[PDB]
Design a protein around this ligand. Sequence first.
Ligand code: NAG
Lengths: 238, 49
Amino acid sequence: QCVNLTTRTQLPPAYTNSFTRGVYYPDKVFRSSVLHSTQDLFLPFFSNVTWFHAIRFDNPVLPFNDGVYFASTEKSNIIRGWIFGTTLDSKTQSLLIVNNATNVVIKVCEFQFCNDPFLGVWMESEFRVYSSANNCTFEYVSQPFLMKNLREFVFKNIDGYFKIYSKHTPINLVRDLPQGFSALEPLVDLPIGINITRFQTLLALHAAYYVGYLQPRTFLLKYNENGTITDAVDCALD
Amino acid sequence: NFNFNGLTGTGVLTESNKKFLPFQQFGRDIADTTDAVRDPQTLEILDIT
Ligand SMILES: *[C@@H]1O[C@H](CO)[C@@H](O)[C@H](O)[C@H]1NC(C)=O
């Protein structure tokens, strides 16, 4: 049920984006007034976070370097999801993450995705994203992340285990990610069992988004007197 | 002895006065020794002395 727009907007896969102090809580351990040194995959501060224009939909399949961060700023929640896997062209499995019916739904399967996938909008529909799927591995459902509000997420895939952490704040500046400390809360944890080397965004049609990459670096997380993170350092960024 | 959904060790149990944020299930002191824990099913904080 695809719209057949195949917009194929052509923009360079790079963008200068000011970005700092975006971390996720690495564990479920509470520490009071402790500086914690953690070795994990985080978006280096002031790293390349590509900004994609959308509907003319700029949505090339982009590399997943260790893991990625995504964010968008739209009141109507027009962006509904993300697609992750080795090729995303039905030859391999991919992770389809969507947001509809005030919930978060994830399916890991081999999907016949449209080159410019959209969610149908009334009645909503997934068949405008892909026509069919087979050789399925996993399904997950969780609470909605919805609240121009900024929705910042980190997407990781460690040894077949997929995680999403997120934070949501109102935003006045939409040309750059907001600055200041932000720590993300875990939303999903799935045994997807697949190789993610590439990804693409899912948009509902009647949209622009940021995406960064992670590196295995030490981060210093500054914890407060009651366990929250108030600041962060990206080891050897500079 | 304890085995709270995989967390093990020994101690004397009393009620905790340490509040955890939604992000955490267990806590630690200076030198990283587990002290307060959240019960795996009940949303209350328990201290392991
Ligand atoms: C991202 O890389 C591009 C190269 O085209 C560069 O122009 C831009 O300044 C970089 N952005 C950041 C934040 O490093």
